[PDB]
Write an enzyme that holds these catalytic residues in place. Sequence first.
Site, PDB file in Angstrom:
ATOM      1  N   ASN A  87      -0.652  -8.039  -3.659  1.00  0.00           N
ATOM      2  CA  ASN A  87      -1.143  -7.179  -4.723  1.00  0.00           C
ATOM      3  C   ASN A  87      -0.121  -6.203  -5.278  1.00  0.00           C
ATOM      4  OD1 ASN A  87      -1.563  -5.970  -1.971  1.00  0.00           O
ATOM      5  ND2 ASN A  87      -2.014  -4.145  -3.194  1.00  0.00           N
ATOM      6  N   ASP A 115      -7.364  -5.083  -5.389  1.00  0.00           N
ATOM      7  CA  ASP A 115      -6.606  -5.346  -4.169  1.00  0.00           C
ATOM      8  C   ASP A 115      -6.891  -6.769  -3.625  1.00  0.00           C
ATOM      9  OD1 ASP A 115      -4.866  -4.874  -1.906  1.00  0.00           O
ATOM     10  OD2 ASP A 115      -6.657  -4.527  -0.732  1.00  0.00           O
ATOM     11  N   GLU A 134       0.831  -1.213   0.000  1.00  0.00           N
ATOM     12  CA  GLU A 134       0.000   0.000   0.000  1.00  0.00           C
ATOM     13  C   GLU A 134       0.854   1.246   0.000  1.00  0.00           C
ATOM     14  OE1 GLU A 134      -2.197  -2.588  -0.515  1.00  0.00           O
ATOM     15  OE2 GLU A 134      -1.789  -2.907   1.618  1.00  0.00           O
TER      16      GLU A 134
HETATM   17  O1  LIG Z   1       0.205  -5.124   0.843  1.00  0.00           O
HETATM   18  C1  LIG Z   1       0.523  -5.320   1.983  1.00  0.00           C
HETATM   19  O2  LIG Z   1       1.786  -5.429   2.291  1.00  0.00           O
HETATM   20  C2  LIG Z   1      -0.408  -5.750   3.078  1.00  0.00           C
HETATM   21  C3  LIG Z   1       0.017  -5.972   4.374  1.00  0.00           C
HETATM   22  C4  LIG Z   1      -0.894  -6.364   5.343  1.00  0.00           C
HETATM   23  C5  LIG Z   1      -0.337  -6.634   6.724  1.00  0.00           C
HETATM   24  O3  LIG Z   1       0.845  -6.441   6.894  1.00  0.00           O
HETATM   25  O4  LIG Z   1      -0.949  -6.864   7.687  1.00  0.00           O
HETATM   26  C6  LIG Z   1      -2.257  -6.510   4.987  1.00  0.00           C
HETATM   27  C7  LIG Z   1      -2.579  -6.220   3.630  1.00  0.00           C
HETATM   28  N1  LIG Z   1      -1.692  -5.877   2.712  1.00  0.00           N
HETATM   29  C8  LIG Z   1      -4.000  -6.330   3.081  1.00  0.00           C
HETATM   30  O5  LIG Z   1      -4.374  -6.111   1.923  1.00  0.00           O
HETATM   31  C9  LIG Z   1      -5.019  -6.718   4.012  1.00  0.00           C
HETATM   32  O6  LIG Z   1      -5.823  -7.372   3.533  1.00  0.00           O
HETATM   33  C10 LIG Z   1      -4.700  -6.974   5.381  1.00  0.00           C
HETATM   34  C11 LIG Z   1      -5.510  -7.394   6.448  1.00  0.00           C
HETATM   35  C12 LIG Z   1      -4.709  -7.533   7.525  1.00  0.00           C
HETATM   36  C13 LIG Z   1      -5.062  -7.819   8.900  1.00  0.00           C
HETATM   37  O7  LIG Z   1      -4.015  -7.895   9.692  1.00  0.00           O
HETATM   38  O8  LIG Z   1      -6.200  -8.066   9.228  1.00  0.00           O
HETATM   39  N2  LIG Z   1      -3.430  -7.245   7.119  1.00  0.00           N
HETATM   40  C14 LIG Z   1      -3.393  -6.885   5.816  1.00  0.00           C
HETATM   41 CA   LIG Z   2      -2.290  -4.939   0.530  1.00  0.00          CA
END
Ligand SMILES: O=C(O)c1cc(C(=O)O)c2c(n1)C(=O)C(=O)c1cc(C(=O)O)[nH]c1-2
Ligand SMILES: [Ca+2]
Lengths: 595, 595, 73, 73
Positions: B261, B303, B177
């Site tokens: 993604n 995403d 992100e």
């Molecule tokens: O692109 C990324 O590096 C990244 C990292 C993380 C994360 O580190 O927790 C999530 C996501 N994306 C993401 O899209 C998402 O769905 C998400 C949900 C969660 C959570 O801890 O509930 N982490 C993340």
């Molecule tokens: Ca993500």
Amino acid sequence: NDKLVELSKSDDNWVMPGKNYDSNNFSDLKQINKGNVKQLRPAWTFSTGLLNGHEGAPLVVDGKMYIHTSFPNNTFALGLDDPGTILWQDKPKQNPAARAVACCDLVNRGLAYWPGDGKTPALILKTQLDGNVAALNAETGETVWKVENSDIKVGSTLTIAPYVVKDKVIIGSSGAELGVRGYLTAYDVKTGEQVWRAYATGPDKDLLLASDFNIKNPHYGQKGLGTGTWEGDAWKIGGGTNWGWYAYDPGTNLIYFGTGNPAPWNETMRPGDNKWTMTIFGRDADTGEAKFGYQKTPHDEWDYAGVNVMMLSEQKDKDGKARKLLTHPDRNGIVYTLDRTDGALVSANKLDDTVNVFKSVDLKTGQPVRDPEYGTRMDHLAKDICPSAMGYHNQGHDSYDPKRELFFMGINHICMDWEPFMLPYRAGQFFVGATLNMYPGPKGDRQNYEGLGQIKAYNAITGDYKWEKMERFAVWGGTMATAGDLVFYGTLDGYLKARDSDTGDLLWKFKIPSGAIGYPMTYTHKGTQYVAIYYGVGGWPGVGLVFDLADPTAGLGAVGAFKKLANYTQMGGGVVVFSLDGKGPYDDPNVGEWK
Amino acid sequence: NDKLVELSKSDDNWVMPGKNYDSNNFSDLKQINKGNVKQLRPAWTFSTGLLNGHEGAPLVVDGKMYIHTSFPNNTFALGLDDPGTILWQDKPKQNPAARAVACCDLVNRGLAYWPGDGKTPALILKTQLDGNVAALNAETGETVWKVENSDIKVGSTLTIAPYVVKDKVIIGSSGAELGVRGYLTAYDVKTGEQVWRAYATGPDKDLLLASDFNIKNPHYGQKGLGTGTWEGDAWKIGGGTNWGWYAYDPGTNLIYFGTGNPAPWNETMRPGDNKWTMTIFGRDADTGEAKFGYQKTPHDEWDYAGVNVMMLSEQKDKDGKARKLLTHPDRNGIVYTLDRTDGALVSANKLDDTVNVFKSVDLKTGQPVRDPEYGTRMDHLAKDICPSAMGYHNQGHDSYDPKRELFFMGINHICMDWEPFMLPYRAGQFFVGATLNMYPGPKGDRQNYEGLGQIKAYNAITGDYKWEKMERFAVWGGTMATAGDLVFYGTLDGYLKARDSDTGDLLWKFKIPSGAIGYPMTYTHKGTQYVAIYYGVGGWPGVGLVFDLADPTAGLGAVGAFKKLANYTQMGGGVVVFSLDGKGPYDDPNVGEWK
Amino acid sequence: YDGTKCKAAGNCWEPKPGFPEKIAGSKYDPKHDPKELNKQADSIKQMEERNKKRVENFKKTGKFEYDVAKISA
Amino acid sequence: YDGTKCKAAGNCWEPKPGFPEKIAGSKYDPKHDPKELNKQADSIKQMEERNKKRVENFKKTGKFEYDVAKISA
Ligand SMILES: O=C(O)c1cc(C(=O)O)c2c(n1)C(=O)C(=O)c1cc(C(=O)O)[nH]c1-2
Ligand SMILES: [Ca+2]
Ligand SMILES: O=C(O)c1cc(C(=O)O)c2c(n1)C(=O)C(=O)c1cc(C(=O)O)[nH]c1-2
Ligand SMILES: [Ca+2]
């Protein structure tokens, strides 16, 4: 309040701090008794979403449980048939500066309830750390009125639970460590209108004394002492705040409570008995006039803030006379029993034989006999003074078994070294003036720093202790007793324990999330008895863990004394509710499910 | 690791994320079975002392339980015979700036364990949000080595659990992100020495491809695609971070996992299949070389970060051939089953009939057939796209019953509206470029905003769902299955539930403090089976509650979708351990008492 | 664009109706700054070097030192 | 000083050996600033007045308004 009196006789409710006006913390329920406590298990839990100390206990009224938290002091109402749904929540917007003037943790002792009349609905009354008092509609949580009681700009905050008597709400005060002169206020429960306000020091007009004040025990002192036992205007920042508990006798119309310590802690800076600080008062509920006032600790030299729990009883004295009494275990190491009608001293016994600060309390003069070797003074390091400033008893709300005539008290076993220092008074800034070192008392382990508490069964007339038991840490929090021959209490190391009322034998314990600094409560919902307790360690003993302090001298000396706490618990915040076999609302798993 | 393989066969241990290398989350223990789950009660609890989401699950090894928390990522070790005593605790000092670059909550998925050899002691491996990786002596908690893996200054953090294979620790990455190009690293478990590092985008040299990469399915694409399916240097900030789970087959020596993604979310700013993002990889454990790579979602427009759980099994396909498989329920709404030896597509079924973004997945071409009506693009507001960016499945670690050949999956039922916007890339700053609106899917209540989850039993060969059940909220967290014919999972509204493996009937539930976003685990200690689960709501679904956000658009669109969460739970953090009748270490109340 | 028309194996992207095959020079041109793009690579380069000093020192002395400035006796 | 020698009822304080009966003018003189001392009284005075406006308005209108500046129609 007559409605509250009636409500308090239903085992389905727990309507006010302390249970009833006697402040018994005693339940006649015996579903859970010594023969089956071993089957006690959690039925359901609830996290408050906040850390820091969770003091007091929840209220249960009309099938709802009301929960309160540490700062910012949120309130939640949960329906007992489906606890999973939060009925309403009140989340106060308060000035963060309030945090900087709390001597201790960001704690709060509880909620109070007013049954409502015809036009005004039932109300939930709450104090906020920022000094506001608020009344909330009990069914919707909407704010009905809100008024300012204390000013943080001058170091005045609120941690005390409101108390509802007749159609009035009594509000205490906090801040003696910042030199706040104590005062209590009664507001009209329906409008927030100030009815009366009485101070702990100063002119008799401010003290709000009855014409017949101390009429039966004139030797306790009468007129002109609020200024007479002080040098100059020093009484203006004299302390005496009341942040503890109350008791009420509808028969005498008096509210009983104690006033806190004088300011500063440096005794050399305030010569005099420093009157009306450290005193047991009996004030009229409607006018606030003091009928009696007995000073327990004249010229405090140890921060023995006299705000502890008041427990009323009727027992026959040594001459066979049936007396209406009040029993009060103080910070100074002495448990006092006075006649609640006139303030006459009945007994004043030591909480533990290791006391030492006072040789004894003369019942005729009413004066505590000081041992000069354990007093404090400028240019001198006092050592091995028992009790420490944390007292042999603190804020914990104890209990009393009427059938057994025994008080079950949560005791502290901590002593100290103390040296004062000079400092100026600046409104809003701390005004302590003493550096302390605290450690386990003679009966604990001073090398390993454990053995900081005790739990004892006491008879106020005989002064005898039916049983005494040591505890790893100070039994902060209080006690609750039941007609099932059980004494319940939470511990700083994370347990809810149940002891045999007759012997003190440990019969059961449960590992709750964090240490408990509140008291257990009980009620019935639909035929089943539940015992509930807050978890979330903090308050004075957990200030080191809570604020990640290391200097043993920090946290007003509490950091060093409780250096081992962190090996047994971490912060938390919530409620755990127990019942036999953990039976509860979700025994039918379909209750509470989305459909 | 052979030692880990052996350890994983003891029901007294739970040595790594996912239980075993198959990543089954399946226990053969049947002390607790469908005939007696109703007697399940808490035996003991422990608060972590932190709020925010508590993901993952604890490890149990050698009679000790190891607990991990949300930021600042503390670690505690508790002895199973006296959980009240904290054996050791590690409390990291991290730069607070790390908080500002976490897209989601300050979450962490778990610990890993290395048994030790002769000279080096057993080790606890942990990631920190600030990007450091650390190995701690399992018996004392002392730090053995600590190295930097990610840089927060550029928006790179760590939330993933380490994975131990042979004598190596595999570390993922987070930050897509913020336009962080994904990479995974293998370090020597004894010294912290970097053995290999592979990227998700760019030059084949960076991709670390095996000479025979995609040899069996060349149509998946082979060489030059990491740059070829991108315009210019856009792959340098191309995303593809891997923050999910792994599986390992000692027989193929391959670690299986998916890449996240592509960045930004604005699809118009990155023309091309954006290869190696959104792909299922099979990489050699020792060299890190990719043997196969299947891209699930070419040119992501929603995403659908392809990082989900990998579950290995051996089943006979439709032709009767016994295959070594991997099953993977993705964010895009499709569950994939591939031959784990060569990456051949076996099945790619819809998680729910309401999908719509893809008409289907062509098994011969391996290309998902897009429905142009649900794609996203600049200057256009897309509506009613299912699944939403939160996917029909997220981070939850599911389970698989070998006897039944059924996968028990925690599913999300959330759809969305989506409109992208142009934005520059600045290292350290967010690089999203899309505004979303999320809500319940067609089978939920879009007016009351409830009915956001489902839990289903699936057969990978037949593609049939044995049973499907709706849930109030998204079943984040995962699932755990047992030979006692029970499927356990935690819910966002605060329960640990147990369903009948054959029918899906709800047999039991318990009201835990806050919602669960981690998965349940089980073990035996001294003949008694315990089921443990973390409580402490958060992660993406609880970002509104956690950060007190109100705009439905905030929290990357999750705030609006989960607007009702707060009426059922507040934050928390800790572990609740259950057992039949709540029997546990303190059944003899004297255990743990000060003496 | 339905992801079915592939130029080559694993290369099936097609621009959407009304959209260009190349965005450079177009209205949707990201106009990315190469100095920004190269920042990540530089970080990893620096961390890898900092870790090398840590690991070599660890191997040699038997005591791990995470503070690089405190390394080299 | 053992708290046993009382000048009057409820007035039993005696200075400790070597200590003065009055600290004013002595080495232990607090030297309190009267402007500081009076701050508390002023605060209470102001809060009480702010609350009076709140309660009277509440009684009259039937709607509580905590913001004093928003009071008086
Ligand atoms: O692109 C990324 O590096 C990244 C990292 C993380 C994360 O580190 O927790 C999530 C996501 N994306 C993401 O899209 C998402 O769905 C998400 C949900 C969660 C959570 O801890 O509930 N982490 C993340
Ligand atoms: Ca993500
Ligand atoms: O003088 C004061 O106004 C005052 C206030 C409070 C409080 O508000 O909590 C405490 C004390 N004193 C005090 O001496 C002390 O023992 C103490 C313990 C606790 C606690 O919450 O555990 N509060 C307080
Ligand atoms: Ca005090």
